Design an enzyme around this catalytic site. Sequence first.
Site, PDB file in Angstrom:
ATOM      1  N   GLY A 138      -6.590  -6.713   5.390  1.00 47.16           N
ATOM      2  CA  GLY A 138      -7.571  -6.548   6.448  1.00 47.16           C
ATOM      3  C   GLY A 138      -8.038  -5.118   6.566  1.00 47.16           C
ATOM      4  N   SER A 165      -3.115  -7.109  -0.571  1.00 44.35           N
ATOM      5  CA  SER A 165      -3.911  -5.949  -0.195  1.00 44.35           C
ATOM      6  C   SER A 165      -3.148  -5.113   0.846  1.00 44.35           C
ATOM      7  CB  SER A 165      -5.285  -6.419   0.315  1.00 44.35           C
ATOM      8  OG  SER A 165      -6.246  -5.381   0.261  1.00 44.35           O
ATOM      9  N   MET A 166      -3.731  -4.858   2.018  1.00 44.92           N
ATOM     10  CA  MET A 166      -3.021  -4.063   3.026  1.00 44.92           C
ATOM     11  C   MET A 166      -1.689  -4.705   3.432  1.00 44.92           C
ATOM     12  SD  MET A 166      -2.448  -1.421   4.980  1.00 44.92           S
ATOM     13  CE  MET A 166      -3.889  -0.585   4.300  1.00 44.92           C
ATOM     14  N   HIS A 213      -4.833  -4.579  -5.132  1.00 43.77           N
ATOM     15  CA  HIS A 213      -6.136  -4.273  -5.706  1.00 43.77           C
ATOM     16  C   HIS A 213      -6.718  -3.025  -5.095  1.00 43.77           C
ATOM     17  CE1 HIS A 213      -8.156  -6.864  -2.391  1.00 43.77           C
ATOM     18  NE2 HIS A 213      -8.100  -5.608  -2.032  1.00 43.77           N
ATOM     19  N   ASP A 217      -7.990  -7.691  -8.919  1.00 47.48           N
ATOM     20  CA  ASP A 217      -6.918  -8.462  -8.292  1.00 47.48           C
ATOM     21  C   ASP A 217      -5.707  -8.654  -9.218  1.00 47.48           C
ATOM     22  OD1 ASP A 217      -8.690  -8.616  -6.228  1.00 47.48           O
ATOM     23  OD2 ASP A 217      -8.889 -10.812  -6.230  1.00 47.48           O
TER      24      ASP A 217
END
Lengths: 183, 184, 187, 187, 185, 183, 184, 184, 183, 183, 183
Positions: E57, E86-87, E111, E162
């Site tokens: 996010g 991700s985060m 990523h 990714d």
Amino acid sequence: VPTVFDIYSRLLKERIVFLVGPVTDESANLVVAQLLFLESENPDKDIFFYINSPGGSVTAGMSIYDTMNFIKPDVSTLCLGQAASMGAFLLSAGEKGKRFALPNSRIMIHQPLISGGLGGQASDIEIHARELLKIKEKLNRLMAKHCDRDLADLERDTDRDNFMSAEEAKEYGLIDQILENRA
Amino acid sequence: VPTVFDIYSRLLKERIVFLVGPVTDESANLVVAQLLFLESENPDKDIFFYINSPGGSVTAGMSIYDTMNFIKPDVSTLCLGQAASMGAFLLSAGEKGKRFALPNSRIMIHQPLISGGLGGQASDIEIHARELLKIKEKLNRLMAKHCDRDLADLERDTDRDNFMSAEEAKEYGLIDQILENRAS
Amino acid sequence: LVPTVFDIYSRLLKERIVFLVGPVTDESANLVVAQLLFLESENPDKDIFFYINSPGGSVTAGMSIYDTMNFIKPDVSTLCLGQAASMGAFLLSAGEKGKRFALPNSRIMIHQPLISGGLGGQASDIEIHARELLKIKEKLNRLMAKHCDRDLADLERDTDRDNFMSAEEAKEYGLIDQILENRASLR
Amino acid sequence: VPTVFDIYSRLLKERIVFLVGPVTDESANLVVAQLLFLESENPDKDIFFYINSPGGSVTAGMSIYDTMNFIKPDVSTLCLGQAASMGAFLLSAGEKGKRFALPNSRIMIHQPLISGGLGGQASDIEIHARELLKIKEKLNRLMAKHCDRDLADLERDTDRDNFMSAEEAKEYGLIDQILENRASLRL
Amino acid sequence: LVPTVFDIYSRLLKERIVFLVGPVTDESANLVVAQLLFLESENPDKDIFFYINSPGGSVTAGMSIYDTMNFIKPDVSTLCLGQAASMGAFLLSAGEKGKRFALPNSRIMIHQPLISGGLGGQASDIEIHARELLKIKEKLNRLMAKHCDRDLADLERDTDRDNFMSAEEAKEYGLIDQILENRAS
Amino acid sequence: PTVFDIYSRLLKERIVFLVGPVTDESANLVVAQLLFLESENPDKDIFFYINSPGGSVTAGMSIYDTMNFIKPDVSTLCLGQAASMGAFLLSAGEKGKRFALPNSRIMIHQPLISGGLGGQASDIEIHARELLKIKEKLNRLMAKHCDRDLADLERDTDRDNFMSAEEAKEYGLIDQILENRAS
Amino acid sequence: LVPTVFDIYSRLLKERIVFLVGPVTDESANLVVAQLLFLESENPDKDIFFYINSPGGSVTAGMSIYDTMNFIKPDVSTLCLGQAASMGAFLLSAGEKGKRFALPNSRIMIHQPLISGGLGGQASDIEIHARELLKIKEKLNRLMAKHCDRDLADLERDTDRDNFMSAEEAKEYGLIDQILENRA
Amino acid sequence: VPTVFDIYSRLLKERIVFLVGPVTDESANLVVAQLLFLESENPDKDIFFYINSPGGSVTAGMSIYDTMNFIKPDVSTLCLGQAASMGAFLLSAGEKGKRFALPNSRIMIHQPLISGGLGGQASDIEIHARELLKIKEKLNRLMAKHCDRDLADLERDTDRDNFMSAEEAKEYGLIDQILENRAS
Amino acid sequence: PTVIFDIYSRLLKERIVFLVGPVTDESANLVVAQLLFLESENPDKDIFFYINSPGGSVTAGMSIYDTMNFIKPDVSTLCLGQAASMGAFLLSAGEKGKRFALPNSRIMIHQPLISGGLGGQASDIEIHARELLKIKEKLNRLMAKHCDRDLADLERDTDRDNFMSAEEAKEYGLIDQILENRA
Amino acid sequence: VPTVFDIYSRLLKERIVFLVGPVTDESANLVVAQLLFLESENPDKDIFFYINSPGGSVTAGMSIYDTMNFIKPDVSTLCLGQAASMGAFLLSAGEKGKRFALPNSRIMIHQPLISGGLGGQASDIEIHARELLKIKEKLNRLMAKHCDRDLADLERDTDRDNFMSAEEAKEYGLIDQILENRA
Amino acid sequence: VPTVFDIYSRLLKERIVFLVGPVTDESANLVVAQLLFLESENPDKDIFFYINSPGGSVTAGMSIYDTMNFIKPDVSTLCLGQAASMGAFLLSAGEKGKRFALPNSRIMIHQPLISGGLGGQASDIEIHARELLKIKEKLNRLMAKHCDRDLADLERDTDRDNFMSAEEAKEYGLIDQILENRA
Ligand SMILES: [K+]
Ligand SMILES: [K+]
Ligand SMILES: [K+]
Ligand SMILES: [K+]
Ligand SMILES: [K+]
Ligand SMILES: [K+]
Ligand SMILES: [K+]
Ligand SMILES: [K+]
Ligand SMILES: [K+]
Ligand SMILES: [K+]
Ligand SMILES: [K+]
């Protein structure tokens, strides 16, 4: 659309008929009208049916198919860009020996798919599911005849999207030759 | 939903459970939870299942149906307003002898109906059509047992929407009694 | 919209009943995870009863429940009511062997993964996600064959398209252990 | 639309008239216009009505039907693609002996269906329901006459969607002959 | 919609369990921060268990969690259940070294940054934000390299597109420390 | 406001409100309150306040049958308006205990379907027959409530029939008009 | 909307100019195909001049133009005005070698395939379409390297992400032959 | 639309005028224009007004009506498909003796129906309601005249939707003859 | 906000009831419910009915009006902000001698207004037009009684929107007194 | 379309070409086609390019620009209404000595601005941001040449929207003359 | 629109001009153009202005009106279907002695009503209200002149919608004769 008669009317003089984009009742019947016209003009000369289409309506496609077989002239077919689903069906329905594709043409065959849905009573859904099965086998039987292949092969090979290059379509028996140039 | 505890929680104390409006996963599972709770409180006392519903999800309805038959307490059913489709199925699935309707209740039965559609490859549509036919027969088989009737009669009588008065629903074997008031 | 008796669901949680109802999402899955951890904390020695009525949903969300079922000490018993489809059926089959149940008219359905919406971007990115999707398909067939005490090849065959099962078929297939008809039994 | 007169105006010279797609007030009256025109041009020569239609408005279809029976020329019909519902009605209404279908045509008959809605007072719904039953019987009577069958047969065979292959439609009495090519005309 | 026992999540909070579930937003991130601060206040010396099931996010929202994790005295142990992407993966790897775990069938994905719908304005404005995005990208690759005890060049290579990892692959990479199958390792 | 909310407090005085469109949820809420009040005291009167334009026939019938089923007398009072099913339930109060406030509006009429009947003609016939049965059933019950003939009700409900409180009393739909507690 | 002088585009068609402007669609591509075939029919010996200002579009639509360019006898000379990106650049590079041009301030861009919307279906179906998209990706790179007289590996490298080229860079790259500044 | 001079214009040479679909200001005035045109071309020959219409705007329909009665030529009417509401009014307005229907035509008559709503002050609603009553009475009187029937009959028979077959419409006096073919 | 009770519950202790914004079935019945409850608390003490409203549903308003006249306590009315249409009706309905307005109140009276519209058959439109006029006449008659004026006065002054300052309202007979402060 | 030939076709006989409203691929190519046409008709006579445009697609603008410089005839430009951004660029690109404006014409210049956004990976965004900067430099470089001004001046004067009167545009070097009438 | 020449061009040869439907700038100016054209064709022969319109834009209507009075030919008007508001204004504006209606024509007159709303600062609202009142007064003055009636009568009779039969309209002075047929 440029004038020279418009360009498509002009190519129609050379007995070129185009099927481009989705097959609908309207796009199909226009093809039917051109086939009937060309036969009327000269019932003995070949017609050249150029196809670049992802397919579309089955009943609409059949009207073209039955007309191709009904009229006296041979309908030669040529694939450019793509012939998928009903597009491939029609490409393969051309007079045997006269089914062609350009070198980077894409062919794709598969079983019927309903977009949207079946909605109604179970009795009604049963009736339409049975019809869909007849359509599926019917299309597999005709396609097998076009390709000079066993029905069992068509059933196997159309279970999911089956992409073929021009050579693969030739080897499959779907077209007769790949044309690179007029030579 | 006025306080008195909200009104429905208060009535739960009297072992009354409501099914109102469309049968959904959420509405069905809330009924199941209430059935289990009442059984937990007293596995021997009857439960009173008041149904006013046009039906809905068949699998959601089956979860209630199976919970009704699994728990120890007798589940008595009462139709008020209407019990149609899965609503009527559940009404007819109440403990035999304890299935009731109020005098002006509407009951309706019919074969399965898909709203929206079957969309995909023919293979998938065939699979889902076959499953639908199975549901149709299963529901007819279960409904004929509830009503103490022939499978062929239910098959005949659910081909199209079949509306029944309380007296007609009684005659058919769908409920046991019409209640006008607490006096008998 | 929930009766008070505690709300009804908090009340059944006292009896170590945990519900999974409707689509499996991150939030619905983690709420289940939390109930599992809570019941374990309250008493690690008692069984948990995990009631499943679900068409499935997110695979990773489902995995968070699955791994939690395996991680905690209590046996997580599973019961299908209404339906258990896809990730729902997976979780049902993941219940402690011997304690996986279904009610008689439950519907179970298993199949290979299907993507909602799409993959959009460069061919490179699509290649990656497709390759990943293939792994998920493989992993799930493997875990599912283990759950069912069946050969992997069997699962691959039987999940190519939607496969609906009655409770008895699901029992025969090895997805559940018992069909429960009514309470009259083991105290 | 290609020009040669546009292509359809061109085929009209050969007394070919098309019905393509849904039957609407506008599409039906265009057919009507062409039929009257062809009659004016030559009241004694056959007209060839090519039909590829899923049907549509009953009153629109009836305007064509009544025009087909009214004009002096024989209206020969040919089904290509499909003739369903009112499309099938019109196909079966061609001059007896001159009703044809291409080999892979799809034919379908069924009872009237209306949706969108019936909205109003019960009194109004009663009037429209009785009228709908009247329409249903009329179409079945006319269809039985077209097919040379008992009314009872049509009532049975249109209760739900009834799909026919070209061959079946021929056996049923809905068309006279199936044409594969121009050598196919028999009898 | 949330069972009562206190509510279920408050109940688990007494045991120092903090959840990050679903998308990281200002509100979801600050809720984690509030809980972290609270648990520190209740007892600054006991470990905290940060359960992560998240697709990532907002970067700034994620950073508020990160700086808070590093700022408070208690060790923050992280556990991935379902996914940490991700985060989400960033925060998972940011757990106290030695105390980063994943359940066996967890999914990890890392990523490079992806930008909100579009950036719109004058070319000058666009230049400023592109520079910032480049600074953001490198900054994250550096911190991640530290978390994983890896070379910056490796994180740059491994996040260009990714990159999905199983728990063991995330372990081999240096992103987590151990996989927990059950309460026994 | 929150006195308990105001409606809960008045429920203690055995006042039950029907306000706005009659739906499954609003009707069943009324049903639950009736059953609750009977459980509290099966012998004391219940006061059913109606301000409603009507709504679902089946939802309304759940209220009607509950009113007749429970032991307590259900007294009815019209305030603002009672139209269609609203007027039906109003006229259904225990005879002698059906009231309206002086400037209440009453309206009765035959059933009307909003939206439509959509499907096959067979299905439409089935539902048209059901709607006609409903129309007759309601006219007979209304005739009983009002101590009037079925023929009168059929005649007087063919179209929207608006009534003042006095007209409603004269028709036999209510027993008394209450201007204040005296009287 | 379009001036007449016959309309302006039909008029330039007499000088054997065919335009590709905007997104390449089935219909926009086949209209080009029609113009190529027509000009060949009018004179199979004279050059055709294909003016391209396009951001690209459907890959299959583009191939129909491409294969027709190569099929017909007349040399199809190409000219870039404004821009030729993606399938647009492919077509530009497909002009008869020695007769591929761009105006001085033209923008060329090349890249790997991009999928519109999404992938929706079963994992099996998803596998089939990914394998197909990869074939297209290699196919386009091979043909492009051939057009540019470059190594296959170079195009694979240079098309991984969006690659913008000025006229000179495109010339140096081998995508075009000459930059036209002035008719004299 | 087929050219032969397009097809509808071609039929206009035979003094055929169509009313098809809803009656609107634009569709009605086009009919009025054709009627005025045909009278100007030949004031002594009959006009053939073919009607397939569900009705529509009352004032629009009245502009056609008054024009039919104003012009010198006899306007003969033929119903094909349907003539409902204003469509039936116009059908019945053809020159007495020259009003026809094809055999399976659907005819329907009823009282005025308002689309949308009447909105404003009570004073304004009163004015518009009074006007609607005059419209209703006027149309029943004109229809009673067309049909050679009592006003009382029309008022009673148009209270709700009143469907008629062609023969029933002849019997009612709405048309004169049913034509099966050119011999009837 | 809460105070020891929400703020409106707290003021109910003062026997203050508000009507604010458009009069709907729900808003009107919440006022009705408060009136009945305040009567049960103490049937003898005055209730203070504060009105800031543009008006709304006629039947909904009439439910309040009749309840005001029905219950035993005097209902004092106070306009703050505005009292327009049914708002003004209810204001002028306060117990005579006890109807008030704050100094900058906006009062407005007019004839009934239908926003939306009569659609359907002419028979149905006639019935509803007849009904509208009755409602129009009854409101003018009642308002004339409230204001101690004759029906013709009210007919004339309500033909179109008629705005009144607090002072004009007093002169008209619509309120008793303007209140600057607690004198 | 007023006919005389529509009006614009008629003016094309006078070698007048219009650019009106937003510059798009289609509107730009229509201009290109007209320029090529006039050159084919007479490569030695001036073309008069009338511009009333707020700008639009930069690549679309460049196709016009490069065509203006490529063809043999002098392309004279005239501003009427306005010439902003790519519109002003094209106005300034007219043959030196033959760039005009009407007295109340508005000119505006500025740096590129993106409608919508840069959306994707940071890598893709860096690529497109660098390109935008190249576009910005190229346009300032070409504009400085057209205006016979320093690159540093254009960089300065286009940082934000810079509106110019006809006289200011002349002073700036963007046009050569202001025309009030044919004298 | 059928060909004969489209149908309306053909009737223009008989000097027939139609106003059908809402009066807009575009529909009004098309009428103006035809009036000017017919005048140029022959300034001495009558023009026949057939009106079927519910009215519309006041300024658009005035453009027709002033043109009718400006040109040399007599403009005779005929109402078919309806002439309401601006439609009735224009009908009544026909050359005196040559204003007609078909027997079942509907005529309606009333005062101006505003489309949409008036929104802005109070000052602007005042300006536009004053303007609307001048328009109302001018329209009543002109209508009084057309009808040979007193201004005060028109003020009275246009306060609300005023529907007239052909005969009432003749009696009012709005038209000269009712035509049943060409006799
Ligand atoms: K053939
Ligand atoms: K039981
Ligand atoms: K466990
Ligand atoms: K015939
Ligand atoms: K820390
Ligand atoms: K009772
Ligand atoms: K070539
Ligand atoms: K006449
Ligand atoms: K009182
Ligand atoms: K030049
Ligand atoms: K004049």
